[PDB]
Amino acid sequence: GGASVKERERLLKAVISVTESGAPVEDITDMIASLPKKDRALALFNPEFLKQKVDEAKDILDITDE
């Protein structure tokens, strides 16, 4: 129902590994950490699911940047 501070930093590392350098990993994490609990746990456990939400977040962050 919102990620703990411990859970949030697990998502941060997880996001960093499937992103390059210079990617907005703090903002991508904020977006994923907002998701329901079953989807957060899925993003720490399935590296391919994580890559799908990291990418579709980083795209919404592009659409919003203009």
Numbering used by the authors: 95 to 160
What text appears in the publication on this structure?
To verify the structural models further, we expressed and purified an N-terminally truncated version of the Rrm4 carrying the three MLLE domains in Escherichia coli (version H-Rrm4-NT4 carrying an N-terminal hexa-histidine-tag). Surprisingly, the unit cell dimensions were small and, with a Matthews coefficient assuming 50% solvent content, only 128 amino acids would fit into the asymmetric unit of the crystal. The structural data indicated that the protein was truncated from both termini during crystallisation, resulting in a shortened version of the H-Rrm4-NT4 protein that formed stable crystals. Both MLLE2Rrm4 copies adopted the same overall fold as seen by the RMSD of 0.29 Å over 59 C-alpha atoms. The MLLE2Rrm4 domain consisted of four helices (designated α2–5) arranged as a right-handed superhelix similar to MLLEUBR5. In comparison to the MLLE domain of PABPC1, the first short helix was absent in both MLLE2Rrm4 and MLLEUBR5 structures. When comparing the obtained crystal structure with the MLLE2 Rrm4 model generated by TopModel, the average RMSD was 0.69 Å over the backbone atoms, close to the uncertainty of the atomic coordinates of the experimental structure. The accessory MLLE2 domain shows variations in the critical region of the predicted PAM2 binding pocket, suggesting a novel mode of interaction with currently unknown interaction partners.
Rrm4 is the key RNA-binding protein of the transport process that recognises defined sets of cargo mRNAs via its three N-terminal RRMs. Rrm4 and bound cargo mRNAs are linked to endosomes by Upa1, containing a FYVE zinc finger for interaction with PI3P lipids (phosphatidylinositol 3-phosphate). Here, we demonstrate that a flexible MademoiseLLE (MLLE) domain platform within RNA-binding protein Rrm4 of Ustilago maydis is crucial for endosomal attachment. Our structure/function analysis uncovered three MLLE domains at the C-terminus of Rrm4 with a functionally defined hierarchy.
